Design a protein around this ligand. Structure first.
Ligand code: MN
Length: 326
């Protein structure tokens, strides 16, 4: 069964534009990332500050911003959690959803920054919203029934040993909340003809979850047969950026090969799981293997690889432009 939305190849002109990274682009992304490169454990003041920063940044871009806040039991007692959901056009029936988690692991060995996990993804979502704002605000006025939505999940990380009850607090809560929130096509702007909408979860057209990004030379694979058509667009976009000579490589005539043109057999627990269980199509943009620094005290700012981050930002901008026809 084919993808419900016909995926129009990005024109060469738009590919080139989305693949440009000005020096002020680098500066803007880095200034954004600075805000996330702090310990932000659930319950903490810096966590509150990060949450408010995400909210303010997106309200400042005229997005609808909602918080899904709740208290939940953990192995460390009751904890406050707040998912941040930003929607460009709330009334649009369908959402291309981009997501990540904004809490950082409470590491028993010491202060843990979680630069890849997931400060970089957080900054990338905000950067996309900011760099594309003009084109997104224009796309919003089309009445075409599609919009962009950014979800910054809280409480992805376990407090103690990972378990089904100790992990994914924010994503489990939100998936449940949206599944139970009933709606229908007649309440929404321009749903696709063959759509089945019974609740808010049905409006998530696909969730692209970014996690553990920022380390050198990540390897991605298609984890889900259901989103192979979408995944293949990332593969194709990356290839064309390389053809166009727009990727940053250590030497001339190398190509990036982040998005493997294959699927892998692997089960990764992450914020997509509660949505996957409710039939939300998932593209999981997480490296395999995980970065070497994963859950170590070395997951920090200096171990990020800036050229890779720039290349990923090009791919993501082109992908959003292609999906939303910006
Ligand atoms: Mn982690």
């Amino acid at each position: 069964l084919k993808w419900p939305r016909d995926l129009r190849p990005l024109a060469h002109h738009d590919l080139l534009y989305m693949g440009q990274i000005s020096e002020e682009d680098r500066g803007d992304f880095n200034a954004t990332l600075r805000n996330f490169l702090v310990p932000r454990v659930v319950g903490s003041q810096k966590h509150r500050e990060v949450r408010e920063f995400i909210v303010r940044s997106l309200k400042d871009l005229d997005w609808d911003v909602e918080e899904d806040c709740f208290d939940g039991q953990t192995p460390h007692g009751i904890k406050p959690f707040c998912n941040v959901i930003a929607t460009l056009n709330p009334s649009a029936c369908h959402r291309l959803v981009l997501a990540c988690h904004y809490d950082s692991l409470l590491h028993k060995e010491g202060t843990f920054i979680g630069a890849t996990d997931s400060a970089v993804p957080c900054a990338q979502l905000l950067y996309l919203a900011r760099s594309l704002n003009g084109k997104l605000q224009n796309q919003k006025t089309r009445g075409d029934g599609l919009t962009l939505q950014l979800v910054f999940f809280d409480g992805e990380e376990a407090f103690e040993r990972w378990s089904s009850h100790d992990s994914l607090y924010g994503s489990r809560h939100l998936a449940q909340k949206w599944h139970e929130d009933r709606t229908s096509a007649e309440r929404l702007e321009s749903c696709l003809e063959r759509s089945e909408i019974a609740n808010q979860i049905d409006r998530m057209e696909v969730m692209v979850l970014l996690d553990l990004l920022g380390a050198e030379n990540p390897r991605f694979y298609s984890y889900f047969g259901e989103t192979q058509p979408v995944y293949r667009r990332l593969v194709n976009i990356e290839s064309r950026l390389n053809d166009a000579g727009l990727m940053e490589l250590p030497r001339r005539r190398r190509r990036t090969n982040y998005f493997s043109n294959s699927s892998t057999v692997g089960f990764i627990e992450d914020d997509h799981i509660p949505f996957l269980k409710r039939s939300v199509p998932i593209v999981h943009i997480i490296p395999s293997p995980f970065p070497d620094v994963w859950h170590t005290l070395d997951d920090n700012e200096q171990n990020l690889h800036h050229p890779t981050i720039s290349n990923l930002n090009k791919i993501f901008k082109a992908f959003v432009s292609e999906y939303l026809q910006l």
